[PDB]
Amino acid sequence: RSITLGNSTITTQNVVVGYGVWPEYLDQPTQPDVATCRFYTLESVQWMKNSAGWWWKLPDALSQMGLFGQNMQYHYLGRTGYTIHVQCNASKFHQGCLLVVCVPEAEMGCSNLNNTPEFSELSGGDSARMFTDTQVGESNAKKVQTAVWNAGMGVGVGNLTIFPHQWINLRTNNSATLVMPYINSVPMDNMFRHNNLTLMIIPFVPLNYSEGSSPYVPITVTIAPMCAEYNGL
């Protein structure tokens, strides 16, 4: 209840941590630990009736975010773990079910079968990109194919539970919490050309409500970097 980091404070009341391991620290990489370790609340998305899903590429949603974004232009390298708090707040008269899954190395697929998607289309900075429940056509050149039953990666979307995940059932549950360690092949990588995590929120059972209730429900994502450090002097 009412946890705080730096100059921010959020409140909480069930956590699922990564692949079982907890994030920790390692020329010489220096340790900045107090200046940017805080809760970065992104803006809320609206869960409507015929909504399809959302995604965020994770070391890119915190690129225009304050002093964390200032520490990226000053540093060529870095390695960072995360802690993600997702909560949506509806009444007891709404009903639905969300899957909050955190995918490492999620290559997206382009709509044209020869090309590859562009950086403006793969990831909106600190802004959610949307799945669709129709097909993106082949005629446009560089756009992400977002048929949500394939999850944009050419796979069964029901089998996405092999990644570290959490269900949000409005009947019983209210929030989700993930703690994701640093997963990469190299120990310290180029932070400008690599988005090594992807946070997806997909409504399996759609939102429903009776006439009179509030016709859409907000979802609030909060990311807090754990064990961030960069390389330089």
Partner: antibody
Framework: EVKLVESGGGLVQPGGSLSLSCAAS????????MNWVRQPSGKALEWLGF??????????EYSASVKGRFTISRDNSQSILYLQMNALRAEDSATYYC????????????????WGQGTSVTVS | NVLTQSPPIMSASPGEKVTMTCRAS???????LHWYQQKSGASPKLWIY???NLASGVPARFSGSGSGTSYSLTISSVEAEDAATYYC?????????FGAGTKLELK
């Protein structure tokens, strides 16, 4: 009841521009897909494009024949659907309809349930 | 993916059963094939959606069928007020292609 009227057709020199407009009343505008279909004089129908609802982000999906020339949009104030036609040719002389789609289960079958009365566009 | 309708011109007296077919070039799914009806000097109307389901306000004389790459539409008893043109729509990829048109004139 559902009522889709539209307006804006007329005469145009080939190589010019024209803007159609579809006025929608009788339903919530931000919840359905809205299409654009043309038909020439006594020929088959031809689908030009649609525009998804608010929950899918108002993205557009043009046909391969008119991609780059035409533009579908909407007005954010009132429930008016637009069609900016640019670079008109000799074979664009047709009757332009305005259609709507809905979800039948929870799925989106690609049918068009309600149609507009049709405005006519011809070139000279 | 183009659709061919046959026959183009169809004539039949009222009271009998007549049917038309719409054969696709490739495989179209059973849920993405629809039938429309356009009278002379009027806009089309959705008639049958997803190859077997009657729309709203349509009389029960019609029943669509077919699967794979061959689809059909049957009229159990032909009246006088349902003489129009009938188109079939599909979706395998974009765009949404229509049929050629089947014109029904009463005899």
């Amino acid at each position: 009841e559902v009522k889709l009227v539209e307006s804006g057709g007329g005469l145009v020199q080939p190589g010019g521009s024209l803007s159609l407009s579809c006025a929608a009343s009788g339903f919530t505008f931000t919840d359905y897909y809205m299409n654009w279909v043309r038909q020439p004089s006594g020929k088959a129908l031809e689908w030009l494009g649609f525009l998804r609802n608010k929950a899918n982000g108002y993205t557009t999906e043009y046909s391969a024949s008119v991609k780059g020339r035409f533009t579908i949009s909407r007005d954010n104030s009132q429930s008016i659907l637009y069609l900016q036609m640019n670079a008109l040719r000799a074979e664009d002389s047709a009757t332009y309809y305005c259609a709507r789609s809905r979800y039948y289960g929870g799925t989106y079958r690609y049918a068009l349930d309600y149609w507009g009365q049709g405005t006519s566009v011809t070139v000279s | 993916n183009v659709l061919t309708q046959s026959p183009p011109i169809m004539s039949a007296s009222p009271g009998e059963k007549v049917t038309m077919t719409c054969r696709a070039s490739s495989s179209v799914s059973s849920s993405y094939l629809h039938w429309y009806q356009q009278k002379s000097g009027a806009s089309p109307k959705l008639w049958i959606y997803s190859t077997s389901n009657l729309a709203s306000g349509v009389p029960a004389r019609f029943s669509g069928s077919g699967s794979g790459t061959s689809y059909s539409l049957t009229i159990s008893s032909v009246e006088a007020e349902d003489a129009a043109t009938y188109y079939c729509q599909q979706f395998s990829g974009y765009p949404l292609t229509f049929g050629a048109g089947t014109k029904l004139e009463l005899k």
